[PDB]
Amino acid sequence: GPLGSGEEEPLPPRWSMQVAPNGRTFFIDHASRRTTWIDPRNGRAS
């Protein structure tokens, strides 16, 4: 998504990114439909 939004490290083949109510953003897993606090693009907590 060059230019039109997308100013960060692209999410892996089966991943996304959405902010939660907890106060921090997580990483959605499309491979198994899940979520995590640590990004897969690298492996560090959001």
Partner: peptide
């Protein structure tokens, strides 16, 4: 904790 598993964060 939080972290809305794949089911809630889909709005």
């Amino acid at each position: 904790t939080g972290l809305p598993s794949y089911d809630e964060a889909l709005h």
